[PDB]
Design an enzyme around this catalytic site. Sequence first.
Site, short mmCIF file in Angstrom:
data_model
loop_
_atom_site.label_atom_id
_atom_site.label_comp_id
_atom_site.label_asym_id
_atom_site.label_seq_id
_atom_site.Cartn_x
_atom_site.Cartn_y
_atom_site.Cartn_z
N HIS A 40 0.81 -1.21 0.00
CA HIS A 40 0.00 0.00 0.00
C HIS A 40 0.85 1.27 0.00
O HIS A 40 0.29 2.36 -0.10
CB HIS A 40 -0.98 -0.01 1.18
CG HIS A 40 -0.38 0.41 2.49
ND1 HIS A 40 0.08 -0.50 3.42
CD2 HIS A 40 -0.20 1.64 3.04
CE1 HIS A 40 0.53 0.15 4.48
NE2 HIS A 40 0.37 1.45 4.28
N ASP A 84 0.20 -7.58 1.89
CA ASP A 84 0.65 -6.19 1.83
C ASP A 84 2.17 -6.15 1.90
O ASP A 84 2.78 -5.87 2.94
CB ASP A 84 0.01 -5.38 2.96
CG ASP A 84 0.34 -3.90 2.87
OD1 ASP A 84 0.77 -3.45 1.79
OD2 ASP A 84 0.17 -3.20 3.89
#
Length: 223
Positions: A40, A84
């Site tokens: 992210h 992530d």
Amino acid sequence: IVGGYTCGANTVPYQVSLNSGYHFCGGSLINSQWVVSAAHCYKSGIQVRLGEDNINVVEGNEQFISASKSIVHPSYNSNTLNNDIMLIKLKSAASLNSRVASISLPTSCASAGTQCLISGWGNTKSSGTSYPDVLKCLKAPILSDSSCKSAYPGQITSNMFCAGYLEGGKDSCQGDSGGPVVCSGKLQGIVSWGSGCAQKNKPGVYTKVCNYVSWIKQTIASN
Ligand SMILES: [Ca+2]
């Protein structure tokens, strides 16, 4: 980092700052030409800044190196934050020394109760905003999977773990994203997400790096 302490200049030599005109995420140097961060944190035009303490003052140990290639995990899901994790290749190899060094990848997954070191230039307040210029540090234990899932019902995958304090007051925070969680000298976690910062019964959630060692090694060997 909320409720942490000032690390001291270059005491965390694998810590990197990701810069696109300004600090926006942390990362970890895993060898002379590769950095691991959170998916992210992805954006184009990343400059990797190594050997940093005060990110607003040139102090003499910095290495600024542009990224040549970014690789988000093939199964990253931005809606759930599953997987992530992201790899960044530097345009040229960093010069490694005592103040700029790589961190070893794990050979096994760390257990609940293990004490870890978390670091970053993120927000230091839980109800407010104050960003430090120097690197902040936090020692925190890995929490059991059951308490992690009980704190975040339906949100914890097998690729996540919780670390911190259920009583609150000490946690990572915005701006620490992508940074390292190091336990027993090995990179075990990546600062991923959480509900606010340092809130009661809402510990930090981190990417479980030990699940990705094979993907990291294969990717680095072919890029
Ligand atoms: Ca600096």
